[PDB]
Amino acid sequence: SLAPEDGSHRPAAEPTPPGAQPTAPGSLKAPDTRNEKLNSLEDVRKGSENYALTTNQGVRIADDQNSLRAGNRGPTLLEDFILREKITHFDHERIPERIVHARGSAAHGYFQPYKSLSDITKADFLSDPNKITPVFVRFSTVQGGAGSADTVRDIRGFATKFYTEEGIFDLVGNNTPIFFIQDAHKFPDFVHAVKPEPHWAIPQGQSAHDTFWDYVSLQPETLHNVMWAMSDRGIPRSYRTMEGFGIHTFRLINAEGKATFVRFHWKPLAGKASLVWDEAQKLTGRDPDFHRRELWEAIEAGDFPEYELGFQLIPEEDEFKFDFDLLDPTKLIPEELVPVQRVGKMVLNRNPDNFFAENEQAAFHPGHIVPGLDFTNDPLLQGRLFSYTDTQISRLGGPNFHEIPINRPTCPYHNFQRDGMHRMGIDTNPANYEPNSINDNWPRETPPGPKRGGFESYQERVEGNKVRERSPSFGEYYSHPRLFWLSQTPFEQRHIVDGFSFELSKVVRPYIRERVVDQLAHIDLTLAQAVAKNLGIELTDDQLNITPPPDVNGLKKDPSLSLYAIPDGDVKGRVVAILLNDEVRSADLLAILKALKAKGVHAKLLYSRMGEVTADDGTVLPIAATFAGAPSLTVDAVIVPCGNIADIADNGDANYYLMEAYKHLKPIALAGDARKFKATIKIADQGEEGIVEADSADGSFMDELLTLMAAHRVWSRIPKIDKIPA
Amino acid sequence: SLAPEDGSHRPAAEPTPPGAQPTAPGSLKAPDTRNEKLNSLEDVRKGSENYALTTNQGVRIADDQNSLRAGNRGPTLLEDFILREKITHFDHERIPERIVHARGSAAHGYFQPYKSLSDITKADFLSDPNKITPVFVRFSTVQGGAGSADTVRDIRGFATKFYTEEGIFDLVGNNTPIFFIQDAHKFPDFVHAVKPEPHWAIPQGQSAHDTFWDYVSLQPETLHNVMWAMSDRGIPRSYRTMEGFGIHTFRLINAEGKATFVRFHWKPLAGKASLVWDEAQKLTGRDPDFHRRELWEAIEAGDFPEYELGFQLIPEEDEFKFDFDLLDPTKLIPEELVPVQRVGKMVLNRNPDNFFAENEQAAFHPGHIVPGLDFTNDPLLQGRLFSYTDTQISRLGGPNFHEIPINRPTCPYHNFQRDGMHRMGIDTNPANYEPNSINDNWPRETPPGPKRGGFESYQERVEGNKVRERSPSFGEYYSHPRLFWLSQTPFEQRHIVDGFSFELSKVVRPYIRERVVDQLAHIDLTLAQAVAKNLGIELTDDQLNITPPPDVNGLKKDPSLSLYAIPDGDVKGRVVAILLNDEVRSADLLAILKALKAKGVHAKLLYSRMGEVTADDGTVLPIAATFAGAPSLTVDAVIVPCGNIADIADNGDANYYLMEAYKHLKPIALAGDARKFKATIKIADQGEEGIVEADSADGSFMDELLTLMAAHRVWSRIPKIDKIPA
Amino acid sequence: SLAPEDGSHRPAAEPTPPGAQPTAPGSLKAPDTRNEKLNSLEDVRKGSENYALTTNQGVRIADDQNSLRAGNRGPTLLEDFILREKITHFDHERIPERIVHARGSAAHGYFQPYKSLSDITKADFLSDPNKITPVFVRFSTVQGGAGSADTVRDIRGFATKFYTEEGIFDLVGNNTPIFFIQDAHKFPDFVHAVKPEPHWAIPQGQSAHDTFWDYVSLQPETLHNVMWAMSDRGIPRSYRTMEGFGIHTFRLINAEGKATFVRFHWKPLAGKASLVWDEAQKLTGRDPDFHRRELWEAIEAGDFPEYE
Amino acid sequence: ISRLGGPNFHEIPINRPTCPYHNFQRDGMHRMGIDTNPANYEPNSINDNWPRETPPGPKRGGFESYQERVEGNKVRERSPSFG
């Protein structure tokens, strides 16, 4: 027995806060958390405890430490079938990664509608508020490989597999409401431009290079989603604190055949929250797995990610009532014109057991719809429908990818398809064709109907010639980028300017920078001027005379486009660094932990070494990490209790902890003699907004700190941080 | 609903004779035939009756007759996901065929030992006479593709997968006791030589071409298995009427660690029986699926193929007591020297449900042994051990081929292997490595022991230098071919001569023919002279002075090497053609069917058209096939009952039916006026051996016929038919 | 060394009648028969005479008769990279066969127009009678596997790859002027019905079984091509003596933008000729390679297959 | 075989030898080399046994393993000297 006698190798199978215990496969951490999909996977789940180690053929292995050789210092023998089986499997472990969205993190959960939607769709999973649908959700970046970092600047994917009683419905969306391009024919062009450049395969996980901004400067249709990527939307704090969008206009079809246009939305119950660029970039180095880890640990703690599904609904007769084309995926539908109507709630409440088998092998595809839904002529969606089926033939090894366990429907499936690589289902049907008499034509077609009916496309009218031709209605590129820009707060606008500025400074060919700035001048001249000055570029008289695009149906601002104009952050599930010393004032720590617990805010106790320190009252404090091992990047706020402050007052890592937190706009609280640290962050004796201070951590101290946390970051501090060397 | 009103489209779930009803998947035909392996496949079996037709994602299909198009005479739309899924799966149905043995037919069954063998092997499946082991068996040819013909002249494969309680054991044998080559390094050379030639990919299923006999003439080690292939061994009547052999010397290991050398044997309880060449070749045209069909119908009839497993056992100390090397796979062990000791019986009693899923994807490999068995230094076996693992990576699409349902062990299997294409098992082990503490080192190694122990190789001595060198003890090539030749009956010797002569006549380069005849002169000069005469080659004086090779340990013959020298026929499961007329004597037919039923012999009612005829007593007789639809090639004997013989007496197909049956040495029985057909085959008034005749089909009539059938063929007829125009 | 002294191992590099000499790879039988496509393949052609036997990495092999073992009667060693490379390549020789038309025989040649067709099409390979276009043609059956027999009753495929100056044009036709079904959505149903039945994978190369005629009886659109299949059209004497059809109506587009509907035809210069059924069936047994052999030997004899 | 899609990975340009290579190996996925050898096996007479084995020698010779001594029993055992 190699496990420690005290059983400390095994995490408790109950919810525990981040860092308290080692993480674990979901079936071991939360065995009582069940749903119909999780239950259906039991046939393929493999145990381990009390089993003998065997080959894949079931032969018990006596010595898993040695190859078979002629003498114990001799050559290895070809007849060692145990060695060759073990190494052969190792040698073939890897499969192709996803062409895009290769980096991602996934969890199990369930969805429930608030009310029956039978009046607008016959989709069974939306038919009854008591009907629970299991889901599997994968969040992702777009550009980088499966081994790339989480907190990059990028669009994020938000893919949901609904295992409904009438088939699998995949809602395959992103965290912004539009995409970069209009027609799917250009997807390889755009993706090649953003991906690592082909001669040297640089840069990973970044749009900050020549070919991306070359394409952008020549394809102004990209400018709307570029604006979103350059905002703090491109660097979310957590998959739990971003929105999701289906982007395309789809259709809802009801039992009477009536079609309603719909765009899909996910709204996070934890609110919207993002990092700042310097923090996000440094965090890809200090913890490239930050979002994967934060998602997994939130679920292990009971901080289940929750999202509200919502519909923007447009009747068929309103198709042409907007300044933009509903079928153009570079255009958003402003919520001020078409509100998001709440539909239901999705809870993610259990992690996978095996990342590769469940996450890496999962296959989502927006062509997977169910009766009650349909497509539109959106020309980006139209080409998507080809790609997601085609790409699985190489990525997952052939056409039986629906038999990979995570991908299997939980409802029945029967047809006349046969064979293919790794075929699992053994069909007993005498017939493999229809029409047939020898099996009385089973399985049989089903007419469409109000429930449990066959799928039939909505019979929309098609008229025109066969043409490769962009719709003229799509030929407008600046008004929605302007609407987004003018919907942001002044500090969000600064971060957008600084996003463009940072990225264009990495473009080696200066004329590309100049051409992008010219595009910006067609959107908004305050933005263009601010970027140009960071690039040493002077706008011309003609550029300063470019007429701005008009409002979007009278809108200059839509409040739903800003992350922060109306703060909506829940503090539950956030985390606070507590900087210890070797004789902490226990009365301070008591008040701190009392208040954090009451708000569901987690804490990590940090010090200059691991092990334990003893407080002034004799309490033994276990150390979660060192100052350098868990940097301020990984937390939302910092608190310094009183005690033997001299122990850490001269510690360079402790002082830098506060300076980095200060620079990144995080709330900081200093008790007692810890107020001496104000000098390090250049805070005057009188204090300033965003720095909590008092003689001791009391009731009022922690209310002030948690109020700051509710507002996410201290935006008023921005004018001071450029003088801070951090 | 498209089935006939009378519900007659479905075969009965009961044993029925060949051709009576449509064949069916094994689960429908015999649902009460069960074993542990068949039962374990129920997780992946799919039904069909009373289910809706769906996509692979579970969406019900309304119209499986049409593509989605813009207008009913317009272009097909990319958004038709139902069409594209269906065509995508069709487009990727095929997987690589096996490099060799691509043509094969398989069935389920079970094995049982007669008595515990624990005195000589600790293998669990041989430890207890009440231990039932499920098997899956695949028979095959070698050279031809998966769509080539069954009754070619070739070696046959005989592979048995044992699903034992201590792991999968694959016994991967052929139907002759030796192979063509000594060292696995030459296998691609030999296989390329026998396969279709690389410029034009001709000929399929035939060794009768230049490159095969080129290789043979230059590699005399091949001559022994060539002898077997040129005998009637190369054209079996049925997979049920041939022997099986493991070929290699293996080892049995008992609980005290003693090693016994062993060669494995399968003896057919239906006896040994082969076709003749003209019949076998024409049958590849009239029914290329004859062996596959015959096996399937025998099982549906309850004529379960049975085979006795036997062991040739040689003590370790007798390794060098023979004239030949025990580890040389071109040498057989004469049963006159080492008898085959009976071990157990295998019964094949159920067909698969889906050929592709169960047959095409099954993976056998002789490196799949279990504790109680081990290898030897046989250099052909040694290289086999590398091949069977390697080849599955492309054939079955990755390293998880053991998770394909037919390949799965029924015993537990757990290890630290992970991922790979189409990974099915979802591991919950916190550890994917050992030694580990975090899962207390589970799954754990098992020390070797008398039962349920871990695998450990027999610690045989290895001594010598690293050399690419053939053992000198392998360098004798003619003694065993000569022993085989001398052990055959005179008519079997004639058929060997005719095999060589026919094949070498299809060799275009005459010098190759001459070099092969020269090799034959080193085996036996009678054989060489007879083949040379058929090729217009005259032996030289030097060739006529070649000394014959020595006897094999004093043996002048070994009758176990002949198909027919020692009678072992068994008529159960054979088939007789009954040639009908439009008013058959019901008394003849009554006595015929009665007598066949008492011996388990089946009958096929044939006529000049399909439909029905009525006997003289009003019995309506359904017709199974026409004379040309089911030629005499497909049956073991022919009976012509009395009645309105004028109806068929001038029918050309009926007359040729008897001429073909006569040429191929099959018993024929003629009742009453059917004796007019004696004129067609030139039988004398007084009769001849092999022709049954009487005033009526009485009981003595049928006893003579069934006695002939038990002798398989009428060998005394050969000189008569050597001049038959048929 | 191993060749006979009289040189009779090697066929003459000039036309010879069927059976007179061993058949050979085309570059060795007819080294002076060229076209632009055949020449463009010289970069990947590999010789053999006077070269050393090597691994795929270029290492010369001294002993290609034996595995490396510990003693000449010992176990084979894992370090034998020459053995493992040779067996690995053999172990992975096969690729998936075509879903349909898996059985097929092919040759090189060229195409030339009789006159300019600029009035009705701007296709460059039809622009004038001096446009020489290399082709590669594959004839096939439909139902059987790659190792099935040639002279089955079946439809035949007739596929031509034109290597034109403005891109590849594949004319993928059959030897009858229609197909069995109207809408591609039904293709897996029809093909599954004619193919070997899924429980036992019987019969090979034959429509003569229940599921095919079940489908036919329930889908009368199939009856026209069934009539052709049941006629002697279904058992051609040679790929040289059958017609070819593109089946579909396509379009020709000229330089002025005018569209003309077109159906494509191949007419055999050797005339139309078919077997009779008893002969065709027995011949699948006596020589399952008859059509492949006959095509190859015709070309080696100089009886070049020609089609208008 | 999985990473590069089959046994012809030596035909991918960067992997190709710059020296000659000839043997009797055939087919495999994405096979680039078109072999004109009448034979795909050795020993053969129909191509006078080309390409031919080469004896080991001081230069341009065939590969032959060093004939080091092997002595022991077939064991799965670590050498004590490694401990």
Ligand code: HDD
């Ligand atoms: C025609 C090509 C094409 C186009 C225009 C798009 N995509 Fe895509 N997308 C793919 C082709 C593709 C793909 C290549 O099929 C991927 C990569 C591998 C895969 O399974 O699907 C994929 C992956 C993928 C994933 C990851 C799913 C997962 O976690 O496995 C998400 C979330 C999206 N896409 C979302 C979008 C959105 C919101 C788009 C614009 C509205 C979009 N894609 C346009």
Ligand code: HDD
């Ligand atoms: C080193 C190469 C090699 C050598 C020397 C042999 N084989 Fe083999 N054999 C294979 C390499 C191989 C293979 C390439 O691994 C096959 C083809 C596909 C497969 O899965 O295994 C195979 C298939 C195969 C099958 C078909 C199994 C099935 O039904 O799927 C049988 C019955 C045999 N072999 C029997 C033998 C016998 C009796 C041999 C001589 C004693 C022999 N093989 C030598």
Ligand code: HDD
């Ligand atoms: C939608 C599916 C589908 C349909 C409706 C058809 N085919 Fe097809 N055909 C294929 C799908 C296919 C294929 C599966 O794509 C094949 C098999 C392997 C391949 O490369 O193409 C093929 C092979 C194939 C070949 C063999 C080409 C070769 O030698 O490699 C020929 C000659 C044809 N087809 C001809 C036809 C004709 C004349 C059709 C009716 C007008 C037809 N096919 C309908």
